[PDB]
Amino acid sequence: SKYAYTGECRSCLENSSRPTSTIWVSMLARGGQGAKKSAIGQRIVATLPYIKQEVPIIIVFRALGFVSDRDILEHIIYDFEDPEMMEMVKPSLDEAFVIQEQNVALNFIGSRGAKPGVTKEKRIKYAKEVLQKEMLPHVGVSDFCETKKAYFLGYMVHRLLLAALGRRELDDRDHYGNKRLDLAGPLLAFLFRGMFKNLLKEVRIYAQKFIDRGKDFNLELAIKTRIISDGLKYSLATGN
Amino acid sequence: LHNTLWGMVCPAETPEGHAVGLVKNLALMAYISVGSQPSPILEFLEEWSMENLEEISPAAIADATKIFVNGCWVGIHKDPEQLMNTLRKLRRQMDIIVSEVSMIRDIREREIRIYTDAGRICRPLLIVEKQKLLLKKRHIDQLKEREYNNYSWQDLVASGVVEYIDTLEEETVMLAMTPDDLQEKEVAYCSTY
């Protein structure tokens, strides 16, 4: 593919309240021979969740709230006296020159989301939400878990650069220590979480239908006992 | 058949045909962790001589070793071996660390990854200290009379003579194939089992 030395992190929140979201920070292959493409080096891009096309990594870092490149390279690069990694990350900064502050970076992120829309503040909010609740949920979901996400993204880029320089071996999909085993417990939990969500949704619909109609509602009748029972039974019966 | 299937997956039991290799079977002593809460590990690490990410300048990360818990970068530590020895002691003593918690030190990269989530596959191994098994004749004598007693496997695990090793922690250990044939005194293949 066009990407050489890609890197991923199938992040999943501790309680698995959401499906696993994958960030795919990767490095472009040396295939472009434009005016100033191959001379500087290789650009680094990140395929964030719920965004339909790649974003340069420095834009994501700036969106996380780090404008000055000193702060960026103090997260990606840990050792100052190491010219090779600095030279290899030069293209990433050179591509992100046009983006200069946090809010414009947020606009960059949000303009390529699910919907283009019309106004600015709405997709500034969209970019803030997708970087706060969908990019690396396992390190932070709270409102002010930005420094931790910045450090983790820096570590990801550092691993990418180390792999590119050859200082690490690329991982194996088979090193069986990289594989987890979903047993009956986690699998049944996966069904039960969604199906309890369905039950709560049904209770909400029923009780809303009664409250707007202008009367108290009996809790016992709101609960559809069919849902959990004949959902778990169906899943264990058919195997789907 | 990857190398890391040693002791976790049977090298022989697979179907032949369109599903060869993809369908496997657990080894006879393979154990899959049900997971645990990483909270007590985090409290212990914070109480220990570890410094959190927000309390450090970025310049200090290079020399220090990173600490990952369940894949989440928690902080950094300046003395890796002391922390590793303490953590291993706690796990072997059935302290706040559950026996199924995998604990890994990538020395060549200055990383300490502590995995606690469910789904990891691990197997029990005897513990070796200075070229000698920690499983003495006393343990075997107690195990022989399991009936009319209360000694059992859990007492071996609590005695610190057997511990569950994960397939990914298995990368950082030296296994002796058999005790009285690989730990004798000769032109030694390895003196740090």
Added chain:
Amino acid sequence: GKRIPFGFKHRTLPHFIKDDYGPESRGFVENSYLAGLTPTEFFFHAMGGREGLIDTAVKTAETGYIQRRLIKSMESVMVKYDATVRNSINQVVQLRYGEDGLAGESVEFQNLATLKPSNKAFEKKFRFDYTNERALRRTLQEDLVKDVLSNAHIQNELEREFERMREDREVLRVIFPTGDSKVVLPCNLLRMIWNAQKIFHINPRLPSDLHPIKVVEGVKELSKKLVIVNGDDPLSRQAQENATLLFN
């Protein structure tokens, strides 16, 4: 194809030290099946066997599709009644099947006795000699040797035979530059000659009563009965000569 890979961190198995390229570490089973395999080499043998099983169970799904595509490429090509090979659109694929006209179930492996020998050996072992009276009298009967030494037409015919054989040798050396004599041809002449020897109780010691002019005439007459491209016009004649050039 390579030795056992370093699946772990620079180790084949946890039981070896890092950076061990020796025979035991990388999967050299020093034990026999009778003696039994030690655990590490047992695992490595299991890896090899698994590779074999994967190849067996995967190569079928490629080879079956290759075979089916080959079938459907030429399911209709057949030998029509003018001995040409044509597809369903009557487009000639080959003017004669296999370029000779012979089915593949009746041909055998044979050795050309003219391609390999050098000029001296070839002339010695293939040119009929008639100046030597003693040898020719040993091989042939008295009447036959008298006829051979008397007539000059027979001597000229034998010289013509050898000349034709020399041109045939040159043609063979053009056809086969590598020099291998192992060709595939319809009739086994050596085994048929042996069958003729045994059927008629031919004594290989006494002189024979076969006139060499009879051999020449018989071979020439036989060459006109082995027809692959029947006809009279020059084109058919040339095609017939080419189709049976090697056999002739």
Added chain:
Amino acid sequence: DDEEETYRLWKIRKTIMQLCHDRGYLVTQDELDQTLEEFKAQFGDKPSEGRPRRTDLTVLVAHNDDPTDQMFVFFPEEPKVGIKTIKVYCQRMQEENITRALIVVQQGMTPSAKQSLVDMAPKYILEQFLQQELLINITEHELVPEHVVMTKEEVTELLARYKLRENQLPRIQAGDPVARYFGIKRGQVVKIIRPSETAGRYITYRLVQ
């Protein structure tokens, strides 16, 4: 370079000689085996600027059956050949009313020159050959068997003998390297003689489409 370029020119001229001979077009025996030293002496040794001008490399050849059918072999100086050059070369051709000729190009010709080659084929036939493709006699390769362009009467006799229609024969592309080497148009037939390991010789026929 100097020596390498004249060696290239000599090899191209030798290949053109062999090409013309293989077409039945009368060339002298000595030209077929002109050595590098002989070429250097007769034409020059330094094409660096001016002594063997490629204009002086123009070759006239005639046909064995009749002197009237002649050709030209040309050598444009510049890498890229275009309408104005082709126009003047065909004007020179018209001055001597010759029909067929080749153009040996160093690098290639413009799409306009390619279009101008194709459109006026019935009036004067013109062939193209990149100089890279003429540094060897491809007909001398061991893979290439013996091609022989067979005349209309022989084709009629063949189709009568085998009772074949025109389009039932095997095909050969007009742009085939061997077809371009022999200079054959659509409708001609190439008698191909091959050596075979089961018959010894096999004569197949290919129709140009």
Added chain:
Amino acid sequence: SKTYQDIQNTIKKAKQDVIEVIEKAHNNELEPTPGNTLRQTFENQVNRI
């Protein structure tokens, strides 16, 4: 028993030769063969032995 002794001696000599080649390569005293890398040359030598 003589055959088993011969096989054991052959395997011992082969292992000794492989250790010798490993020692030679560990000191950068192994001249690579033309057309192959040093690692490939070492692997070829071990495989041939």
Added chain:
Amino acid sequence: FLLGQSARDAERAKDILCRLEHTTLRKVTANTAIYYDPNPQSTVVAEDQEWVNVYYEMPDFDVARISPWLLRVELDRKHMTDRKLTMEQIAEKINAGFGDDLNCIFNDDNAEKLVLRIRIMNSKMDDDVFLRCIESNMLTDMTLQGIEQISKVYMHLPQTDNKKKIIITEDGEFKALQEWILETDGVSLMRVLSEKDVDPVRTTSNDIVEIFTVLGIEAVRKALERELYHVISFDGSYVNYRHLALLCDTMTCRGHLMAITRHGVNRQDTGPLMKCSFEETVDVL
């Protein structure tokens, strides 16, 4: 295959190998730099002072208004010796590729440090960025010698009697004479065939498209025959000749190479029903 004396003498064969193998400026440069140098006389490198000073005495169109952006290349010793080049060839190639705007400065072959300086002549971001761009381009996409596609050409004696040259002696005995051969890892058949001292008769390619586009249709038929036979009889299995002949004739019956796929079988003039039974059923109908 080598035609003349190079087929026997080893070092002529090595010369042919060097003349064929692609050798870009990579694998021969130790380390490059873009050292600033506002003036040529004073320089910025101690090791490049005296020979720089004596070279720049002659004002041969390299002093007038040269840009101060220097490019030091620092060629290697072992790689250059193995590849057997010298400074003047590289300078000539650089000048030819980039004209006179990239004047080249070199010291000698006797220096312990093989340096090489490149500047920009007076005649659009900046000179530094452009200099870096051309440095990368010259390091990657500049040919010193060889053919642009040949990658890892090898050399070995053919031990088996099938590949070595087979000839007839004066007495006619087939002699299994042994000669040098070369095997590449890339196909540029018409360039390699035209090279000096290379047999244009026995030089073949395992690739099939190159044979078709260079030699002919009958040539690719024969090459396909030989390649299929090589595949089948590699393990000792034997298949009668006529079946291979039929397959090769079928794929080359219609002038061009006809693949055994939908893209080659369904493009014939066969009836629609046969094609639809093959594959792509509804599209054909």
Added chain:
Amino acid sequence: VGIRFCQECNNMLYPKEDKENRILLYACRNCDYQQEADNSCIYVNKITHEVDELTQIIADVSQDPTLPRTEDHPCQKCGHKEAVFFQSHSARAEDAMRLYYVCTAPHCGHRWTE
């Protein structure tokens, strides 16, 4: 070689030249800060094997149980008669099966090749 940032907006410095003085200036391409260079280097590239692994190995590698130990190569500085040897396994070379030795003494760790 050598990367440092301006003190105003803390962004990456870039090379530049002036015609009036003809002196290299590492100026910030974002803000309006300029400074005089002191190395006259812009872009140093290293094609052949100059990795210098001797200064790249972490001295704490000696205390890894999975590495071999030898007594035939004593430490040069502290004189300890035990060392841990290992290979590189880094890309960009894919060759040079050489041994790097690290002393196993605490408060030491001199790296040496041989």
Added chain:
RNA sequence: ACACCCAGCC
């Protein structure tokens, strides 16, 4: 029907 497993022989 359909779908999904499992399994047999190559």
